[PDB]
């Protein structure tokens, strides 16, 4: 198109995953880190005029209720602060190529993982933590590293509670934020697909709530190598596929008990979920 088109950008991942245009751009906050010294900038974009052209801009999608960010206009860096430790967050950059009625804009989302040591000694770690899955297909996720000295075999882990939803490039009508009493949005439409007696509960993403019909659940935690699955044909309604990304906490148990009653340091929110249609896997030769 014009000289202002462009189509991407991308800052990476300081996970050493390669190539970076396989991963969505991702950064975690090492366990006992801080969130001050991992602050990304651009790497890759293909505006004619490059990265030191386009206007930044950032906005705060996860957690709302804790967490801000900022970015420099110029150069793209971001930063983050008040993501708490054990939690992901999630923002939305927007870069824009020249001025006017010419002006292009192009977002896409950036991933933060603050890692942490919880109880029993577990360092719960997907690499990737941004799962990126077809909602036609379905798919599972990585399976995640759990911290040296944990029984893999006693270790059980399922989603809980707190449940976000943020439309990304659906329509507008998927309506983005928390699962919550009396707010009707994407996921309280997605809840009810499940079940209309689910409510804000755990079920419509538990291994333990299905287990003898686990290709009903939205999504599962399978107890052997802790993936998250997610199933076909169901993130979707009349208006379109799911395009955006969900956060969940999970909770894990390390003596072979359903963990939905698991304290508040064996509590974690590891992993995004990002649906788009466009999203083949990469296999890797298996
Ligand atoms: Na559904
Ligand atoms: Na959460």
């Known amino acids: 198109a014009n000289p202002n088109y462009f189509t991407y950008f991308r800052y990476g991942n300081n996970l050493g995953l390669t190539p970076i245009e396989n991963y969505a751009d991702q950064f975690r906050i090492e366990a006992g880190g801080k969130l001050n010294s991992v602050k990304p900038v651009p790497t890759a974009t293909d505006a004619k005029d490059g990265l030191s052209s386009l206007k930044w801009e950032v906005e705060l ?43 292009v804009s192009v977002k896409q989302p950036v991933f933060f993982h603050f890692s942490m040591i919880s109880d029993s ?3 719960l770690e997907y690499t990737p933590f941004v799962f990126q899955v077809n909602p036609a297909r379905g798919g599972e996720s990585i399976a995640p590293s759990l911290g040296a000295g944990i029984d893999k075999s006693t270790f059980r882990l399922d ?5 976000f939803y943020y439309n990304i490039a659906g329509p507008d009508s ?22 209309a007696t689910a409510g804000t509960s755990r079920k419509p993403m ?17 107890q052997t190598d802790f993936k998250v699955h997610i199933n076909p044909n169901l993130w979707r309604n009349k208006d379109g596929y799911a395009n955006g990304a969900m956060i969940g906490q999970i909770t894990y148990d390390v003596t072979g008990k ?9 509590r974690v929110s590891p992993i995004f979920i990002w649906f788009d249609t466009k999203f ?3 296999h890797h030769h298996h």
Not at 159 to 163: I, L, P, T
Not at 174 to 181: D, E, N, R, T, Y
């Open 121 to 123: 000694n577990v360092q």
């Open 159 to 163: 989603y809980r509670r707190d449940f």
């Open 174 to 195: 998927h309506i983005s934020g928390a699962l919550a009493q009396k707010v009707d949005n994407f996921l309280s439409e997605m809840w009810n697909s499940y079940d």
């Open 61 to 103: 999608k996860h957690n709302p209720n804790n967490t801000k960010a900022t970015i420099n206009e110029s150069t793209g860096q971001i930063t983050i602060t008040g993501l708490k430790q054990g939690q992901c967050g999630m923002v939305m950059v927007t870069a824009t190529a020249g001025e006017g009625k010419t002006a």
């Open 258 to 266: 359903d963990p939905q009653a698991a304290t508040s340091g064996a």
């Open 206 to 222: 538990s291994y333990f709530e299905n287990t003898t019909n686990l290709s009903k659940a939205l999504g599962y935690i399978d």
């Open 280 to 282: 083949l896997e990469h």
